Design a protein around this ligand. Structure first.
Ligand code: MET
Ligand SMILES: [Cl-]
Ligand SMILES: [Cl-]
Ligand SMILES: [Cl-]
Ligand SMILES: [Cl-]
Length: 247
């Protein structure tokens, strides 16, 4: 395990996660660690490859997603560090403005528990639907009380939502997939979560590890690098408010 002690294998999303990790590689190298990043296109395999012990950690999900994944998939993963937040947004599909919303419009949303709930909460915040009191972080389409435009919620894998912009009136995208598809939340989103919102302190992206590894020296070194002034400044200067360092 001496070679293992110096290497940090991290499963991550393409953007911003792998780009942020690439900047942190020089920080960790100076500290005697070899950061090795593998990029994943989905939200399932990064947790499975940490649970199996193939990777030391992953950098792709928020706290509600991890909790729901531990319950729904039987993983035992832990949040080793809170790093950044990505404003969730409603982006144009076949309609370019929310003022154009009309009866029966399809809205594409992520189909996992917490990101679907997040999409329904963002639609509620924009007066499109209302949800039952107490629906919360695991709100489903069955929690919809009011639906004045009789919108059709089209549930797809989060990675696929940006690819149905010619099939649905609007699409609700995770920051990482909006960036991957070339969107800018600040310029292109029709509506998005505010940086002083409840979502801003709830959907924080983390470093997740197997239970019992959250205090490993190398994990603590990785988390400290990602929360450093060099990484926070890189995030602020690069992503134009689409990625916000956690504080
Ligand atoms: C896999 S949970 C979603 C993570 C995504 N980067 C977000 O902050 O919306
Ligand atoms: Cl609009
Ligand atoms: Cl439609
Ligand atoms: Cl529906
Ligand atoms: Cl996905």
């Amino acid at each position: 395990s001496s070679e293992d002690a110096k290497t940090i294998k991290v499963a991550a999303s393409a953007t911003p996660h792998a780009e942020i990790l690439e900047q942190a590689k020089s920080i960790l190298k100076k500290e005697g660690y070899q950061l090795e990043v593998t990029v994943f296109d989905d939200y399932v395999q990064p947790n499975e490859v940490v649970e199996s012990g193939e990777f030391d950690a992953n950098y792709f999900q928020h706290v509600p997603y991890l909790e729901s994944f531990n319950e729904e998939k039987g993983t035992h993963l832990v949040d080793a560090g809170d790093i950044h937040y990505e404003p969730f947004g409603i982006y144009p599909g076949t309609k370019k403005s929310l003022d154009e919303i009309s009866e029966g419009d399809k809205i594409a949303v992520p189909n996992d528990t917490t990101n679907e709930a997040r999409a329904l909460l963002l639609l509620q915040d924009n007066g499109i639907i209302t949800l039952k009191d107490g629906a919360g972080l695991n709100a489903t389409v069955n929690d919809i009380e009011e639906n004045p435009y009789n919108v059709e919620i089209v549930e797809l894998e989060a990675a696929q939502v940006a690819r149905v912009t010619g099939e649905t009136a609007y699409v609700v995208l995770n920051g990482n997939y909006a960036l991957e598809a070339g969107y800018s939340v600040a310029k292109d989103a029709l509506a998005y979560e505010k940086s002083d919102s409840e979502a801003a302190k709830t959907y924080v992206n983390i470093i997740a590890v197997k239970e019992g590894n959250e205090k490993e020296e190398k994990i603590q070194a990785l988390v400290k690098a990602l929360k450093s002034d060099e990484i926070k400044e890189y995030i602020e200067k690069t992503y134009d408010g689409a990625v916000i360092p956690f504080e």
